Design a protein around this motif. Sequence first.
Motif, PDB file in Angstrom:
ATOM      1  N   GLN A   1       0.826  -1.200   0.000  1.00 30.54           N
ATOM      2  CA  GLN A   1       0.000   0.000   0.000  1.00 30.54           C
ATOM      3  C   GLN A   1       0.858   1.247   0.000  1.00 30.54           C
ATOM      4  O   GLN A   1       0.647   2.167  -0.799  1.00 30.54           O
ATOM      5  N   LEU A   2       1.809   1.304   0.922  1.00 29.78           N
ATOM      6  CA  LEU A   2       2.652   2.479   1.038  1.00 29.78           C
ATOM      7  C   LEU A   2       3.461   2.688  -0.223  1.00 29.78           C
ATOM      8  O   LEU A   2       3.680   3.825  -0.658  1.00 29.78           O
TER       9      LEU A   2
ATOM     10  N   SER B   1       4.218   0.394  -7.395  1.00 33.70           N
ATOM     11  CA  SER B   1       3.149  -0.543  -7.106  1.00 33.70           C
ATOM     12  C   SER B   1       3.616  -1.972  -7.298  1.00 33.70           C
ATOM     13  O   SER B   1       4.480  -2.260  -8.129  1.00 33.70           O
ATOM     14  N   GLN B   2       3.042  -2.869  -6.513  1.00 33.42           N
ATOM     15  CA  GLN B   2       3.224  -4.289  -6.697  1.00 33.42           C
ATOM     16  C   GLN B   2       1.899  -4.981  -6.448  1.00 33.42           C
ATOM     17  O   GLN B   2       1.051  -4.504  -5.695  1.00 33.42           O
ATOM     18  N   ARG B   3       1.734  -6.113  -7.108  1.00 28.88           N
ATOM     19  CA  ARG B   3       0.427  -6.678  -7.395  1.00 28.88           C
ATOM     20  C   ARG B   3       0.028  -7.680  -6.328  1.00 28.88           C
ATOM     21  O   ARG B   3       0.059  -8.888  -6.556  1.00 28.88           O
ATOM     22  N   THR B   4      -0.421  -7.189  -5.194  1.00 22.93           N
ATOM     23  CA  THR B   4      -0.734  -8.189  -4.191  1.00 22.93           C
ATOM     24  C   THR B   4      -2.120  -8.778  -4.450  1.00 22.93           C
ATOM     25  O   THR B   4      -3.033  -8.049  -4.841  1.00 22.93           O
TER      26      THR B   4
ATOM     27  N   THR C   1      -6.076  -1.659   5.390  1.00 22.79           N
ATOM     28  CA  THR C   1      -5.367  -2.338   6.455  1.00 22.79           C
ATOM     29  C   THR C   1      -4.434  -1.433   7.230  1.00 22.79           C
ATOM     30  O   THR C   1      -4.338  -1.548   8.454  1.00 22.79           O
ATOM     31  N   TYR C   2      -3.718  -0.566   6.528  1.00 19.42           N
ATOM     32  CA  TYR C   2      -2.870   0.419   7.178  1.00 19.42           C
ATOM     33  C   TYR C   2      -3.688   1.281   8.113  1.00 19.42           C
ATOM     34  O   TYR C   2      -3.296   1.535   9.259  1.00 19.42           O
ATOM     35  N   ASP C   3      -4.851   1.708   7.644  1.00 21.64           N
ATOM     36  CA  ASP C   3      -5.675   2.620   8.408  1.00 21.64           C
ATOM     37  C   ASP C   3      -6.272   1.933   9.615  1.00 21.64           C
ATOM     38  O   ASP C   3      -6.558   2.584  10.625  1.00 21.64           O
TER      39      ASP C   3
END
Lengths: 209, 97
Positions: free
Chosen positions: A40-41, A98-101, A184-186
């Motif tokens: 996300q970050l 970005s990476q594709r989770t 999720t971060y939030d």
Amino acid sequence: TLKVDVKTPAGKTDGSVELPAELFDVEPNIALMHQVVTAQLAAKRQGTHSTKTRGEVSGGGKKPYRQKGTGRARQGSTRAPQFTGGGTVHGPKPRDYSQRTPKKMIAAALRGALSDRARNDRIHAVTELVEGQTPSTKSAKTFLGTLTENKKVLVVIGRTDEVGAKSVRNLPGVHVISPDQLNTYDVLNADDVVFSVEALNAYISANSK
Amino acid sequence: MKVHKGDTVLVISGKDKGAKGKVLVAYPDRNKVLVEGVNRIKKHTAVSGGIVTQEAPIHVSNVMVVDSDGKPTRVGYRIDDETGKKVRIAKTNGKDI
RNA sequence: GGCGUCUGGGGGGAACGCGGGGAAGUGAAACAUCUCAGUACCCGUAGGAAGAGAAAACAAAAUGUGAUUCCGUGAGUAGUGG
RNA sequence: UCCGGCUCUACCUGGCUGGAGGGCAGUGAGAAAAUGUUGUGGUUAGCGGAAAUGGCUUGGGAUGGCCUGCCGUAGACGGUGAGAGCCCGGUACGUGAAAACCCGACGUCUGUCUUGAUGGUGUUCCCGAGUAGCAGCGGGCCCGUGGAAUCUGCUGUGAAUCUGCCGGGACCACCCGGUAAGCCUGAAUACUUCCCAGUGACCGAUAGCGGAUUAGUACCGUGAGGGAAUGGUGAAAAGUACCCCGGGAGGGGAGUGAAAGAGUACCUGAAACCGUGCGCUUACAAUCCGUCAGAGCCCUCGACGUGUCGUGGGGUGAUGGCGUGCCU
């Protein structure tokens, strides 16, 4: 199976929610949660950093002096890296991070996180934060004082209920969210989480089918 | 700019904290104003020069406009829609200052 | 052809486009066919976008599709190739 | 739908040439010009805008710490004499346009079908010509002449109109699809000289645009063309009045200032480098310049005693032994 009591601003309880078992008894996988928040970050992070290599700088396109006879070294441009004004060699460039989770890893993260909060009794519900259609942050702040003492907190209010958002926006700790963009971060940055009941119902009847 | 020449002001910050004063000139392009009796400096002027004690400019965000009731008060702006003016007005009373 | 009158055009521009022309160092451990590239560059004309565009098309006996363009895949495959 | 006249002509019909209600459409690609209303519709200036001179201490200055209150559809940001939600500028939010410009909206204005259509029925005529096709050299199509279609450029030759013609990767027969050689066509797409507002796990004066400083300038070249260097006083200049030495520069006192180890050569202010003092050592000696032992002198800490060794430590270091720079 965990139960929650809705709460009112005027000092009463309306009813109880009987949360699911499978969303909110997941065991967390810390590596999973780490990976996903890192992603996300990274995607947040923009790649505005560029530099001009030997081929984009000004000039340098003339062999500045002879190959031999001079005494001094051999040089082929006045903008090469070892000069002072010369090209960056292996520099930053404008790129994506970005990476594709995958969807399953993401949702597993979110369910595990909500479980981590639920087991420790930090998920509160509420019908509303306000009286009719007039924002007043003093109201919401007093109500969160009633309901909570910790520094930071998450709020999940839908789109139409704009008054709660406009109210609680300006507070120091709070970080408001719509449950359509629930992440999720939030969640993890917080200590308590305040759902609306409409929000819970939407979340649950959107995931469960 | 919420200060004009001829107004009266109360100093907030400096050694001269707690000073009434009269505005003499303003410098709106840089938000500084030369108040009377404050920021006293011993300038050397050589001619027949001499060590002479002169004023210097406050920055305008170190003075509160003294209310008409003689207290440091903010100022704001009504409209007298008939006459089409925008009068500078205290935010304790509402009066004309 | 000459004389008079009336309207146009004439040049500049940072990239982007369409039509035409059009290399070479490089790679091939040499090299000419090939590749680099129909790139760089040059020309003629534009527009706020351009060009293409309504089937003398695809397809395979499936009772199928239905102008064009740009994106993802098919595919680094069928193939082509001193 | 009614009629006016026209079908050369008066008369029955069929077919035109006019006007009229009407309908349709319109600045459309499908014809084109201007018109006047016109929308708190948009752009081109802006404006208001909540709440602490709060108390003690520090300090040159409080925007700090600690303790008390408040606002909040406004704790984004910046500045203000040191980290400021409550000082300032402004934000959330709501406001605002005489004129011009752009969107549609309209009514003008313009046409346009209206004199009409649905279907029947057997045969002649038309269905885009120097073209399509074929041959010869060539381009580009996955395809480098190969069995090589389709698309095409120059020459030469050169056909038919629906049982016609072109294609379905040589070609032939059957079936299939489609009807060339006349023309226009929006939307999705690409791009930023300029303009407006912001963001940054981008730089922060040898970096970042070549250009934070007169920068495509100075300087170089005949010319095309190359192409540099230099940011910071302090909170505010209060920029050292006055005196003394000196020709003057420059400096010493006196002053400003919180500090002049901030003086317009100024934040801090490294190393190389240049010198002044204090201690040791060095003019009979052969030294990759050091290392191991170490005399002697000088400084220091500590236990003691009229000066004195120590589980000491540090600077120099006579003399002896050992010892052939660093990298590729």
